[PDB]
Amino acid sequence: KRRRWLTDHQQYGHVVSHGLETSVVDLSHTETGAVLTVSTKAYEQEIEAVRMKTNATIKVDGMVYNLLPNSERRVVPLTVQLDSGEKIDMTSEDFDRCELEAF
Amino acid sequence: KLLVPDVSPLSPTAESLLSMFEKVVIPKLTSDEEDRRKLVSLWSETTLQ
């Protein structure tokens, strides 16, 4: 069944649906130092605009982040069902760190 | 591991606030000369430190 313990929901969880593999980048908030993640296919224009050093800062929803030095990865979006009959969206990368119920 | 983790270059707004606090504080925040003088002194001290 390949179930994993999700810490945040204190429950076992199970993979229902796979997305295709998206390239993803990391954006760190300027004020708080917070760290976010973003689909490169959506923000492609602005990201390439920062790669050309022209406008060096990416604004999203009035909160502005700086692109990290590399942080370019290939991840798979997953719909993870919970034992409550619940649904979450989780990255491949994060669901991978989680702890198996049967190994 | 001498680096402090999660630190990033300041936004042009937050950065302009540094050249502004040296001037703009004086006319805008308060016009009382005591507070103006003392605040300019505080800014100098803390920038130096």
Side-chain angles (χ1 to χ4, degrees):
Chain A
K1 228 159 302 156
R2 307 194 188 273
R3 295 161 97 235
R4 291 176 199 241
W5 179 263
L6 317 173
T7 287
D8 301 339
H9 309 262
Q10 285 300 105
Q11 266 175 71
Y12 282 115
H14 152 93
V15 174
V16 178
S17 317
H18 330 266
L20 316 171
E21 57 177 10
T22 320
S23 292
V24 127
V25 267
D26 191 330
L27 311 178
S28 61
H29 186 41
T30 174
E31 306 173 1
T32 323
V35 159
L36 189 121
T37 238
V38 142
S39 10
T40 204
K41 194 192 161 192
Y43 290 76
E44 240 174 32
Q45 298 192 355
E46 326 180 20
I47 299 169
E48 293 169 12
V50 182
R51 295 182 195 184
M52 298 192 70
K53 294 185 175 181
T54 305
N55 21 277
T57 327
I58 291 166
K59 55 187 171 190
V60 186
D61 311 324
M63 301 192 65
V64 74
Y65 321 93
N66 331 333
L67 170 49
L68 286 209
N70 308 122
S71 111
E72 293 155 2
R73 49 213 165 165
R74 214 122 208 184
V75 306
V76 175
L78 310 159
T79 320
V80 167
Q81 199 188 348
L82 275 38
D83 221 320
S84 296
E86 273 309 315
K87 282 168 189 173
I88 315 180
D89 300 331
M90 207 174 308
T91 330
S92 188
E93 174 188 351
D94 300 290
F95 183 74
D96 232 86
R97 306 292 171 193
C98 304
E99 183 183 358
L100 300 145
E101 131 157 275
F103 206 175
Chain B
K1 80 177 209 158
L2 293 182
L3 289 164
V4 168
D6 263 345
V7 79
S8 197
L10 283 71
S11 53
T13 312
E15 147 257 77
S16 85
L17 183 50
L18 303 183
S19 54
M20 279 177 60
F21 200 95
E22 196 174 355
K23 299 180 168 189
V24 160
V25 153
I26 315 154
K28 292 195 191 171
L29 272 199
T30 237
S31 59
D32 303 278
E33 293 173 3
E34 299 183 334
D35 295 336
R36 281 173 167 177
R37 206 164 311 180
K38 298 160 189 178
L39 276 233
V40 174
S41 67
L42 273 221
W43 197 240
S44 98
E45 298 169 35
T46 310
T47 294
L48 204 71
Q49 280 174 304

Short mmCIF file of all heavy atoms in Angstrom, two decimals, chain B residues 1 13 23 31 44:
data_model
loop_
_atom_site.label_atom_id
_atom_site.label_comp_id
_atom_site.label_asym_id
_atom_site.label_seq_id
_atom_site.Cartn_x
_atom_site.Cartn_y
_atom_site.Cartn_z
N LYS B 1 29.74 27.33 8.08
CA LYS B 1 28.98 27.33 9.32
C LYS B 1 29.34 28.55 10.19
O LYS B 1 28.96 28.63 11.36
CB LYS B 1 29.14 26.00 10.07
CG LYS B 1 30.39 25.79 10.89
CD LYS B 1 30.27 24.43 11.59
CE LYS B 1 31.03 24.40 12.92
NZ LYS B 1 30.52 23.33 13.83
N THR B 13 12.95 48.97 -1.07
CA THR B 13 12.17 49.77 -0.13
C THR B 13 12.86 49.83 1.24
O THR B 13 13.12 50.92 1.78
CB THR B 13 10.75 49.20 0.06
OG1 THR B 13 10.17 48.94 -1.22
CG2 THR B 13 9.88 50.18 0.83
N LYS B 23 17.41 61.37 7.09
CA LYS B 23 16.79 62.67 6.78
C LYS B 23 15.32 62.71 7.19
O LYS B 23 14.94 63.41 8.13
CB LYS B 23 16.89 62.97 5.29
CG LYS B 23 18.29 63.07 4.74
CD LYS B 23 18.22 63.38 3.25
CE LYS B 23 19.56 63.79 2.69
NZ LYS B 23 19.41 64.29 1.30
N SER B 31 8.65 67.06 14.87
CA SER B 31 9.35 68.33 14.62
C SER B 31 9.97 68.96 15.88
O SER B 31 10.54 70.06 15.81
CB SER B 31 8.39 69.33 13.96
OG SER B 31 7.24 69.57 14.76
N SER B 44 23.24 57.53 14.58
CA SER B 44 24.71 57.51 14.44
C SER B 44 25.37 56.40 15.28
O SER B 44 26.14 55.59 14.76
CB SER B 44 25.31 58.86 14.81
OG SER B 44 25.79 58.83 16.14
#
